[PDB]
Design an enzyme around this catalytic site. Structure first.
Site, PDB file in Angstrom:
ATOM      1  N   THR A 123       0.932  -1.470  -0.144  1.00  0.00           N
ATOM      2  CA  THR A 123      -0.093  -0.042  -0.383  1.00  0.00           C
ATOM      3  C   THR A 123       1.196   1.192   0.304  1.00  0.00           C
ATOM      4  OG1 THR A 123      -1.737  -1.198   1.286  1.00  0.00           O
ATOM      5  CG2 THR A 123      -1.560   1.549   0.995  1.00  0.00           C
ATOM      6  N   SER A 124       0.595   2.258  -0.951  1.00  0.00           N
ATOM      7  CA  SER A 124       0.869   3.529  -0.587  1.00  0.00           C
ATOM      8  C   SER A 124       0.593   4.100  -0.543  1.00  0.00           C
ATOM      9  CB  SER A 124       2.545   3.286  -2.074  1.00  0.00           C
ATOM     10  OG  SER A 124       2.666   2.716  -2.154  1.00  0.00           O
TER      11      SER A 124
END
Ligand SMILES: *[C@@H](CS(C)(=O)=O)[C@H](Cc1ccc(CN)cc1)NC(=O)CNC(=O)[C@H](CC(C)C)NC(=O)[C@H](Cc1ccccc1)N=[N+]=[N-]
Ligand SMILES: [Cl-]
Ligand SMILES: [Mg+2]
Ligand SMILES: [Mg+2]
Ligand SMILES: [Mg+2]
Ligand SMILES: [Mg+2]
Lengths: 226, 196, 244, 243, 250, 231, 241, 204
Positions: free
Chosen positions: B1-2
């Site tokens: 995830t970012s």
């Protein structure tokens, strides 16, 4: 298991194979993995079979009572929210992986639910050991504004990809079509590409082949009476 | 995830990728990680999807009930409710949440809540597996009181790099803009951001 | 507080009687008469229904005679709803005993259990007692055929013939007059019906008014059969004994 | 009849006589007031000096809730304390969860619902206190008054106890003569006066004045007791006005 | 903040009467007339929609309720008590039966569960009995069609036809004359409408009458196709139009 | 009349009769006096005997090294409330390494007594207490009534004929408050005060009970020949 | 005569405590009215601030239950607030569990089932209030549902509550007898509020200033209350025609 | 250690023309040690037959449980339970112990008294229903039984042919399993007569 769900012009469609396995053996060759929740809300299940069955039945029962109480058609989000909150509670120990789809006054909906209680929204989804075979097909051929005829073809093709290429998945293809303003049509054994071929021999034995020690009549009735 | 949330002159912008992985398989390539707990209080979710959803759903419930009784809650209040759940259930949760919101009084505010359940109010915050690769970039390029267009570019370039290097991150870059003007959703596709 | 409104259902009168038990018995005295008669080769249960209406669906109706297991039945006098609560408890107790010992429950053990439940409501809890009297008709391999009765006090006693409900004074005198120890089921059937026919507050005793049952060890090959009589079968036995 | 013997019983009127009887206990108590000013509130109370043996300034009646809310009450003093103890638990759990200190309207309902709950069952007695309370929150100053029924409203001025009619008349003059508003330091002086004027109803015994205040400018929005020179200035102003 | 009523509010008086049950029955007597008639191929239940105001939308107030797909209920007496009994009856049909056996309960057993709930309000601590009598009509595979009455005591009786509430004495006499064991469902509906007209003062039409049937399976009302065994609900509430049609042939 | 069956019922004039009847048990109790200066605080108690064979009922209880009370009314209720005070004093010491303030001790007793007056089934406490103590703000004397009302005072008395002692202290106020650094003279003033509440009986050696706490004086009770000095 | 003190049956089959709770309803001496437009539901209520010391902004018997639902109460304020808090809690819990906003009629039913419990269980008294719920429901459209101390509830085309409810009811009855429709055929809520106020003026025979009224308006996806100045604008428009 | 294979044993059920057959071996062991050669695994509640393999203490417990439940069913319903309903009852009862299950492999067999339709069903230990048209297998030689059934079986066998097929399926499967055998029983079930036959098999 190979289950999938995808949306089309004025509806949503679910697909599933019919093979239930215990480890490497085939327990069931014609099992219904498309579970009834409400007249127009259906649920595909993968993972532990009893878990997927029990959780859909339970939420289906509660959805029915909720519908009676509120005098309204049940919504797919209600089934989704109740399923996820139950599955989350049990921390994945209820190993049910589900694709929920349906129609209600809000419109048509398609969701996936994982055993740990996470949910996804998608236009096309697949779950189970054949999900990658199915998703390959859906990624190659899915587009916006599919007709019902295209959608049934794509859904059944996605399930087939799993049947052939995945050992976990097999036998027949079940489909359920939920279209807006229409009765949901449940199509069990939509495809039957794995009928067993006729056997070479008949193994019907000559009578008296088996050695017998005793015989008796079993009384199954109530009261033998005077 | 970012994921990331960035305050700027007119308010705050939340940004996220759209990839959800089960190991190396991309389970969902179009995930919406920007989630609404109140009209102008949103959050970015990282960690266990089950856990962050379950938390966000409870927070939405609490702020809805807060609103019925005491009117609009502050962004600080939302962050506190997130924190309370995360901290008290730290043994059973894997949740890394960035809370971002717009008051008229306070303007744009960003609060980050990492694994422990600690709260940190920041001008901007980055989180998720892909954030490691852009600590350098984000520190060098962030300025306070940026314009809306500058902040959109800052997030777009940042998450572009995060996506480039992190296998766990990818897909579209979603953004949600929170200002007095309202709530605006933005989306940016691979063909746009990859060539940056 | 709440004390103001408490009837105090579980207290003695100055005379040493339990008010609510006595008043529950008064309630039961107005209920339709039920008669049990025990013979050497079986037990008869006869009982009068209370609500004669032509529109009552009699064949699917059960207010008086209930089955507890394959060996034990009861005749009810009092509040039917109260009786059904107890009946379901008794049905469970029988199956618990069967699960534990792999043998059918002895009749007295079942009766005691129910009677102990009724007793509890007279000694603790502050609730009203059950306004029910049972006649238990049953069989087991220890004592053979047994009749018992229990009442709201939780006291139970064994009988050769007994009545509960309305006109028990009159009914018990008539049974005491015509009962004998060597009697048979067919004779007891006749005695039960004759007794109801005289003690009934109705103008005449008819089939639509009665519930009737027999427990016989006259099933095929020395087993015990519980027969709950159908409306037509009650009508036949009324003609046979010469009452209609 | 018999409708007044049990709490939570509706009379044929539609009245709960036990609550109305609790009001009689409030009416029997000492006079307490509240004055809403420009950026805050002022609370004052009549403390009857029963005897010379009472230590001055020690038997404090006004109570703080959290750091920003003041509570004063007339009637059964222990009931008032029990209610403030609850208020403190409510204000603590609000801050614990929502971080921000409890708003005054929010706080008012917390007491309101709790007092109302004591009119729902026969197993509890209604509160024998009217409670005047308030403070400064993010939306500014608020003054409330809460009766034995659980009824409460926002006020410009509030008064309860034996000298309430006298006080109310004085408060009504201040409202008419200061529509633009009253300053915090003015409200302290006027509060002293009003308690002194309201002491004609309890004129047999002499008394001790006690005042507190929250004000955004004068106390940083925190509850503080009026002490020393400022208290004496208010007593002098009050003593001058009665003569 | 305690429930201190752990003692019965219903007790035996010296005469043997349970006062509160008798008084509940008096409340049922004051209530509007409802009736039930059993035919060979169906059951009908009917009542008057006594509208409390003309501004009220009497369609929203359902006096006739579906309990299961094959079981329906109507009442006379206190409406709120009925409403909560319907909620409990619907739920108990699932918890104590459908979730165990995978099928809906038969009429008599659902009735038994409702009866039990009402009995408990007649003996439990700190409650009054329910102030309703119910008429429960239903069908199941092994018992066929059936009609049951359930009283505040928890007592229930099966009926061929009956009436409860306001004009029940007159209505039951009317039903005795008209009922026979060869009635078709349409004949029973006709008789129901006739019987109900006697107890109604004001307007008599589809908007002021509520009427439902337990009849044939309705696959059209099911909502889905593809399972041959599920043939649809036998319970059906007659529309305002469907009632008015039969009132012309009256 | 109709409104005195339990503590949960207000009368039509706003009175709690059960609380007022509990208040009456105090008036029937034996007299006890409390008074203080700036340095010390003193309890003096007239103990009551059943007859000439019996012992004299103890009136004074120690709560901590720096606090204790005298009782008048139901002695078992004083035992309950004193035990509660002991625990609260002890909790303060163990958790906060802090001696419990006398004012705070009063607040705790008020609230404990209050709960019994608002709830059904319970009864008010049937005892009045005079709590003395020396804390971080010097000497203190409290009067506890089982209505809940606790009052900080220079001096007071409770029990039968307590009005005589209370009038004396009201006159003596300016004198005894100044008795600083002299425990014996403060006790004398307390013994002289309690003497105003005597009729027929006089202060004998096993009749009188005195307690004191102060600056460099732990709470200590004097009975028997220890109080012969003050007779 | 303890059958009149708790919720048990009198010999007549009556619950006197329920009947006396209905009488408590009119203790405020306030009349409320609710009507439905095409796109809206308007609720108006009399506002009486007898004391000059009262902060008139805090005197209200209209509550915002959820975003979509509004509730006006006829009865004493402590019971009104008891009911309001519960309805808010129930609406929020509903949304959490079932994933969509609680409908007005379902909330009304829920609150009515709660009211029923107080009429059957002895230890709880009935609340002395009549709750009028209003919304623009996403399925049913403009909705008015009213609950009372008996636990009774029903939908309404329009309704009125209070001491002079019969006068308001007959006035509204007569209007809908003319128009022959279930609602006020009007596009803007502003004109539906003007209708409501006008028909209350006619029914009660009293004129109103801006501070004598209190107005609540339900539209699609929000319920809101009008300020004194918003009402003043309404009163100007009524007077100008 | 594995509970399902301490005691051993097998059940097989088959459908035929207007009939069903259910059969079981008679072995109860403690792993290698044979203990009893009379441990029947097929019970009946009215006309519904239940075979149960697996851990023997649970086999006995569940028999006693379903006897209990079907007895109460009959008293309340006033009729014997049917195979389809009982199947749901078994499933319910197994799944209610989801997280502490009975270590069993139940098999329902019977003919619906009203419709006359032959019915068989199998379950896993937590109640998942396998409602087969052809056959159900269960126990420690389930693989062996699957192999025998899948080749030997053909649909619509007459009762006396079906007897031979199910018997040969059981026997030959059992002889390839160490923990099955020691005798066998075959029930041939028709709408209103049931014949029980004990088979001669090798006693090792
Ligand atoms: C495919 C899922 S998968 C392996 O992820 O591709 C199917 C899905 C499915 C089949 C059938 C239904 C019908 N209700 C619904 C969904 N699932 C399976 O093949 C999984 N199979 C099973 O769970 C077995 C089913 C039996 C009927 C053979 N059950 C088992 O293997 C259990 C599992 C278990 C046992 C104890 C504790 C936890 C789990 N027992 N064994 N061996
Ligand atoms: Cl509810
Ligand atoms: Mg990438
Ligand atoms: Mg009540
Ligand atoms: Mg072998
Ligand atoms: Mg061997």
């Amino acid at each position: 298991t190979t289950i999938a769900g995808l949306v089309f012009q004025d509806g949503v469609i679910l697909g599933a194979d019919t093979r239930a396995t215990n480890d490497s053996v085939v327990a069931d060759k014609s099992c219904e993995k498309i579970h009834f929740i409400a007249p127009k809300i259906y649920c595909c299940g993968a993972g532990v079979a009893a878990d997927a069955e029990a959780v859909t039945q339970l939420i289906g029962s509660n959805i029915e009572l909720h519908s009676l109480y509120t005098s309204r058609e049940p919504r797919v989000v209600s089934a989704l929210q109740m399923l996820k909150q139950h599955l989350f509670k049990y921390q994945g120990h209820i190993g049910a992986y589900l694709i929920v789809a349906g129609v209600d006054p809000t419109g048509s909906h398609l969701f996936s639910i994982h055993a740990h209680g996470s949910t996804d929204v998608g236009y096309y989804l697949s779950l189970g050991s054949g999900s990658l075979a199915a998703m390959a097909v859906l990624e190659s051929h899915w587009k916006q504004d599919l007709t019902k005829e295209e959608a049934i073809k794509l859904a059944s093709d996605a399930i087939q990809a799993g049947i052939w290429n995945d050992l976990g998945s097999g036998s027949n293809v079940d489909v359920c079509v939920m279209e807006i303003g229409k009765d949901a049509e449940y199509l069990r054994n939509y495809l039957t590409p794995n009928v067993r071929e006729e056997k070479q021999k008949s193994y019907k034995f000559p009578r008296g082949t088996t050695a017998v020690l005793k015989e008796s009549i079993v009384n199954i009735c109530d009261i033998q009476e005077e | 995830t970012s994921i990331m949330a960035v305050t700027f002159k007119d308010g705050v912008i939340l940004g996220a990728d759209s990839r959800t992985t089960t190991g190396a398989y991309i389970a969902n390539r179009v995930t919406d990680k920007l989630t609404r707990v109140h009209d102008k209080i949103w959050c970015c979710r990282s960690g266990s999807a089950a856990d962050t959803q379950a938390i966000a759903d409870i927070v939405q419930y609490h702020l809805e009930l807060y609103t019925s009784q005491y009117g609009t809650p502050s962004t600080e209040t939302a962050a506190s409710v997130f924190k309370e759940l995360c901290y008290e259930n730290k043994d059973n949760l894997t949740a890394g949440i960035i809370v971002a919101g717009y008051d008229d009084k306070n303007k744009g505010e960003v609060y980050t809540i990492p694994l422990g359940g600690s709260v940190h109010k920041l001008p901007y915050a980055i989180a998720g597996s892909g954030s490691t690769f852009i600590y350098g970039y984000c520190d060098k390029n962030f300025r306070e009181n940026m314009s809306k267009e500058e902040t959109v570019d800052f997030i777009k370039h940042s998450l572009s790099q995060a996506i480039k290097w992190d296998g766990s991150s990818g897909g579209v870059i979603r953004m949600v803009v929170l200002t007095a003007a309202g709530v605006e959703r933005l989306i940016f596709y691979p063909d746009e951001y990859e060539q940056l | 507080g709440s004390r103001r409104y408490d009837s105090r259902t579980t207290i003695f009168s100055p005379e040493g009687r339990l008010y609510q038990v006595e008043y529950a018995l008064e309630s039961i005295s107005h209920a339709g008469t039920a008669i049990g008669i025990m013979a050497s080769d079986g037990i008869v249960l006869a009982a009068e229904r209370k609500v004669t209406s032509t529109l009552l669906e009699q064949d699917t109706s059960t207010e008086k005679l209930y089955k507890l297991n394959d060996k034990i039945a009861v005749a009810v006098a009092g509040l039917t709803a109260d009786a059904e609560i107890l009946i379901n408890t008794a049905r469970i107790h029988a199956q618990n005993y069967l699960k534990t010992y792999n043998e059918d429950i002895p009749v007295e053990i079942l009766v005691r259990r129910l009677s102990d439940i009724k007793q509890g409501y007279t000694q603790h809890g502050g609730l009203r007692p059950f306004g029910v009297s049972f006649i238990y008709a049953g069989y087991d391999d220890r004592y053979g055929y047994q009749l018992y009765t229990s009442n709201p006090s939780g006291n139970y006693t064994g009988w050769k013939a007994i009545s509960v409900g309305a006109n028990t004074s009159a009914a018990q005198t008539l049974l005491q007059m015509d009962y004998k120890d060597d009697m048979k089921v067919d004779d007891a059937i006749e005695l039960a019906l004759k007794t109801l026919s005289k003690t009934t507050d109705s103008s005449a005793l008819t089939y639509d008014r009665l519930e009737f049952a027999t427990i016989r060890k006259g099933a095929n090959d020395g087993e015990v059969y519980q027969k709950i009589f159908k409306p037509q079968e009650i009508k036949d036995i009324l003609v046979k004994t010469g009452i209609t | 009849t018999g409708y007044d013997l049990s709490n939570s019983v509706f009379s044929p009127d539609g009245r709960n006589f036990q609550v109305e009887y609790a009001v009689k206990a409030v009416e029997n108590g000492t006079t307490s007031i509240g004055i809403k000013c420009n950026d805050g509130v002022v609370f004052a109370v009549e403390k009857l000096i029963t005897s010379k043996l009472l230590v001055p300034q020690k038997n404090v009646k006004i109570q703080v809730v959290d750091r920003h809310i003041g509570c004063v009450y007339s009637g059964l003093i222990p009931d008032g304390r029990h209610l403030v103890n609850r208020g403190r638990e409510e204000a603590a759990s609000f801050k614990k969860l929502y971080k921000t200190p409890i708003p005054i309207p929010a706080f008012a309902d917390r007491l309101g619902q709790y007092v109302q709950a004591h009119t729902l069952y026969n197993s509890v007695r209604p509160f024998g206190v009217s409670t005047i309370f308030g403070g400064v929150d993010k939306n500014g100053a608020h003054l409330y008054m809460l009766e034995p029924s659980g009824s409460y409203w926002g006020y410009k001025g509030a008064a309860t106890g034996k000298g309430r009619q006298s006080a109310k008349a004085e408060l009504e003059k201040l409202v008419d003569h200061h529509p633009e508003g009253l300053s915090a330091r003015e409200a302290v002086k006027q509060a002293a006066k009003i308690i002194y004027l309201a002491h004609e109803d309890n004129k047999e015994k002499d008394f001790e004045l006690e005042i507190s205040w929250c004000s955004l400018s004068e106390t940083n929005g925190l509850h503080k007791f009026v002490k020393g020179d400022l208290l004496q200035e208010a007593i002098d102003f009050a003593q001058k006005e009665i003569n | 903040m305690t429930d201190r009523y752990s003692f019965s509010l219903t007790t035996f008086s010296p005469s043997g009467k349970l006062g509160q049950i008798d008084y509940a029955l008096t409340a049922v007597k004051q209530g509007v007339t409802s009736l039930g008639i059993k035919a060979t191929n169906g059951v009908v239940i009917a009542t008057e929609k006594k509208s409390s105001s003309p501004l009220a939308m009497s369609e929203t107030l359902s006096k006739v309720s579906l309990l299961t797909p094959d079981i329906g209920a109507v009442y006379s007496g206190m409406g709120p008590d009925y409403r909560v009994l319907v909620d409990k009856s619907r739920k108990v049909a699932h918890t104590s039966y459908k979730r165990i056996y995978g099928e809906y309960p038969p009429t008599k057993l659902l009735v038994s569960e409702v009866a039990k709930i009402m009995q408990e309000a007649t003996q439990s601590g700190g409650v009054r009995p329910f102030g309703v009598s119910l008429l429960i009509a239903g069908h199941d595979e092994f018992n066929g069609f059936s009609l049951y009455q359930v009283d505040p005591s928890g007592s229930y009786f099966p009926w061929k036809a009956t009436a409860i509430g306001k004009g029940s004495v007159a209505a039951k006499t009317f039903l005795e004359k008209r009922w026979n064991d060869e009635l078709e469902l349409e004949d029973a509906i006709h008789i129901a409408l006739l019987t109900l007209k006697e107890s109604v003062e004001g307007e008599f039409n589809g908007d002021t009458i509520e009427l439902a049937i337990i009849g044939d399976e309705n696959p059209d009302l099911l909502g889905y196709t593809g399972i041959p065994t599920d043939k649809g609900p036998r319970f059906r509430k007659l529309t305002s139009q469907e009632i008015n049609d039969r009132l012309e042939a009256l | 009349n109709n409104y005195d069956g339990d503590t949960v019922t207000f009368s039509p004039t706003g009175r709690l009769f059960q609380v007022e009847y509990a208040l009456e048990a105090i008036k029937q109790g034996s007299v006890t006096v409390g008074l203080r200066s700036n340095t010390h605080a003193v309890l003096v108690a007239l103990k009551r005997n059943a007859d000439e064979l019996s012992s004299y009922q103890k009136k004074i209880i120690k709560c901590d090294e720096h606090m204790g009370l005298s009782l008048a009314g139901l002695a078992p209720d004083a035992r309950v409330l004193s035990n509660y005070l002991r625990q609260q004093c002890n909790y303060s010491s163990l958790v906060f390494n802090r001696k419990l303030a006398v004012e705070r001790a009063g607040h705790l007793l008020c609230d404990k007594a209050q709960k019994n007056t608002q709830s059904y089934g319970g009864r008010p406490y049937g005892v009045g207490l005079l709590i003395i103590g020396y804390d971080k703000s010097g000497a203190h004397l409290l009067e506890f009534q089982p209505s809940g009302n606790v009052t900080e005072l220079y001096g007071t008395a409770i029990g039968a004929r307590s009005q005589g002692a209370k009038t004396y202290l009201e006159r003596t106020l300016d004198t005894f408050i100044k008795i600083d650094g002299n425990p014996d003279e403060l006790i004398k003033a307390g013994v002289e005060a309690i003497s105003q509440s005597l009729r027929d009986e006089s202060l004998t050696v096993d009749n009188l009970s005195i307690a004191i706490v102060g600056k460099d004086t732990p709470f200590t009770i004097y009975d028997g020949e220890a109080v012969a000095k003050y007779i | 005569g303890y059958d009149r003190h708790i919720t048990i049956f009198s010999p007549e089959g009556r619950l006197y405590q329920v009947e006396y709770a209905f009488k408590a309803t009119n203790q405020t001496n306030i009349n409320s009215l609710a009507v439905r437009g095409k796109d809206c539901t308007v609720v108006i209520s009399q506002k009486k601030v007898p004391d000059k010391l009262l902060d008139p902004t805090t005197v209200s018997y209209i509550f915002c239950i959820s975003r979509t639902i509004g509730m006006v109460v006829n009865g004493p304020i402590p019971d009104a607030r008891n009911a309001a808090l519960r309805a808010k809690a129930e609406a929020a819990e509903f949304r959490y569990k079932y994933g969509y906003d609680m409908p007005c009629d379902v909330l009304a039913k829920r609150m009515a089932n709660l009211s029923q419990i107080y009429t059957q269980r002895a230890y709880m008294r009935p609340l002395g209030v009549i709750l009028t719920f209003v919304s623009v429901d996403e399925e049913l459209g403009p909705s008015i549902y009213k609950t009372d101390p008996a636990g009774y509830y029903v939908g309404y085309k329009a309704t009125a509550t209070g001491p002079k409810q019969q006068e308001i009811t007959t006035n509204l009855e007569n209007h809908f007898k003319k128009s022959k429709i279930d609602h006020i055929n009007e596009e803007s809520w502003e004109k539906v509020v003007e209708f409501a106020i006008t028909h209350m003026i006619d029914a009660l025979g009293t004129e109103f200033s801006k501070n004598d009224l209190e107005v609540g308006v339900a539209t699609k996806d929000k319920f809101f209350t009008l300020s004194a100045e918003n009402i003043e604008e309404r009163l100007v428009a009524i007077a100008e025609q | 250690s594995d509970p399902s294979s301490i005691n051993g044993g097998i059940v097989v059920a088959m459908t035929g023309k207007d009939c069903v057959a259910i059969a079981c071996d008679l072995r109860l062991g403690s792993q290698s040690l044979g203990v009893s050669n009379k441990f029947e695994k097929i019970f009946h509640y009215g006309h519904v037959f239940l075979g149960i393999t697996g851990l023997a203490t649970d086999v006995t417990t569940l028999n006693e449980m379903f006897r209990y439940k079907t007895n109460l069913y009959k008293l309340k319903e006033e009729r014997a339970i049917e195979p389809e309903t009982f199947t749901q009852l078994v499933s319910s009862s197994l799944y209610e112990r989801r997280f502490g299950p009975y270590f069993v492999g139940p098999v329902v067999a019977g003919i619906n008294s009203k419709s006359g339709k032959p019915f068989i069903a199998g379950f896993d230990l937590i109640g998942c229903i396998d409602e087969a048209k052809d056959f159900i297998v269960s126990g420690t030689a389930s693989d062996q039984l699957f192999g025998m059934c899948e080749s030997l079986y053909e649909p619509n066998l007459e009762p006396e042919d079906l007897f031979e097929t199910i018997s040969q399926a059981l026997l030959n499967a059992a002889d390839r399993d160490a923990l099955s055998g020691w005798g066998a029983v075959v029930y041939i079930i028709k709408k209103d007569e049931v014949v029980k036959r004990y088979l001669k098999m090798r006693q090792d």
